[PDB]
């Protein structure tokens, strides 16, 4: 039998958890006592800042990590960090299918990582211990963000302070107040209880998380090619139905938000929105 360790880093219930509980499912049903999928939820093997060369390494077979994760593999996938570069989640999806979209999908094969799919979380909201009407209020916080540069710049083109942190820390960052605001989809947010220490959070949409499901080449190409090509089919069926969903667990982490009664929600106003994309669009220069 072999064996597909699946390690992420978020709850059980969001679109990547329930997309890594469908992979084994569908493995195990179509392929029994010939492939055995073993997921990992919420960093119990492996968190952000080691399971890229736990994969490597052959200690992990299947990742799903965000696209904003992959700088130190290629700077080719910066292109979905870019803030409000894609309007909504259709948008990122037309992107991806597309054949540029494609091929990004073996921008590490020299690296060793193979890119099987795409899934989607959803949209970007922010967060904060105080409101985010206008992107003046952004001023001078400390905002953690994923591991990378273009983030990074998000921030500090808002002058604004950012920490990379692994998201298995976002919580107690927020508590102990080494930051004081973050960005993230609802399904996050609501999954690992950070509305308890963000009172404010705007639906900015302003940029999106969504992850590229990857194995080890070496482990995926020594497979017995049927069980490569069946694994393959099985993986789009997922993907599917992970994309069918994510808008309705984002909009229904949410909800769950508003019934937590310790946060708000700010819409933004039509100025408020061309104010945000005024601040934030200047960091596409430093990513051509």
Same mark, same amino acid.
């Given at each position: ?135 003046? @209020? #952004? =001023? ?6 994923? +591991? !990378? ?7 500090? &083109? ?93 909009? @229904? #982490? =949410? ?6 009664? +310790? !946060? ?7 100025? &408020? ?16």
């Amino acid at each position: 039998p072999i064996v597909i360790k699946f390690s992420h880093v978020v709850a059980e219930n969001t679109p990547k958890g329930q997309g890594a509980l469908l992979f084994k499912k569908l493995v195990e049903q179509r392929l029994g006592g010939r492939v055995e999928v073993d997921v990992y939820p919420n960093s119990s093997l492996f968190g952000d800042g080691k399971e890229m060369e736990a994969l490597l390494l052959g200690d992990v077979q299947m990742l799903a990590p965000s696209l904003a994760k992959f700088e130190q593999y290629t700077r080719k996938v910066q292109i979905f960090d870019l803030p409000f570069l894609f309007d909504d989640i259709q948008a990122v999806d037309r992107f991806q299918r597309s054949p540029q979209g494609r091929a990004l999908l073996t921008s590490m094969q020299g690296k060793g990582i193979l890119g099987l799919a795409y899934w989607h979380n959803g949209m970007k909201q922010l967060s904060a211990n105080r409101p985010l009407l206008e992107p003046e @209020d #952004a =001023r001078g916080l400390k905002f953690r963000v994923q +591991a !990378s540069d273009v983030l990074n710049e998000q921030f500090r &083109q808002l002058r604004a302070i950012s920490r990379k942190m692994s998201f298995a820390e976002v919580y107690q960052g927020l508590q102990t107040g080494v930051v004081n605001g973050t960005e993230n989809t609802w399904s996050n947010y609501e999954s690992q209880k950070v509305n308890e220490v963000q009172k404010y959070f705007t639906e900015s949409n302003h940029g999106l998380v969504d992850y590229m499901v990857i194995t080890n080449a070496k482990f995926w190409n020594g497979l017995p090619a049927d069980i490569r090509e069946e694994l393959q089919r099985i993986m789009d069926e997922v993907t599917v139905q992970v994309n069918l969903e994510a808008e309705r667990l984002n909009r @229904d #982490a =949410r909800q769950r938000i508003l019934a937590s009664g +310790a !946060s708000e929600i700010h819409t933004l106003s039509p100025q &408020q929105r061309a104010d945000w994309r005024q601040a934030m669009q200047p960091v596409w220069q430093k990513f051509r």
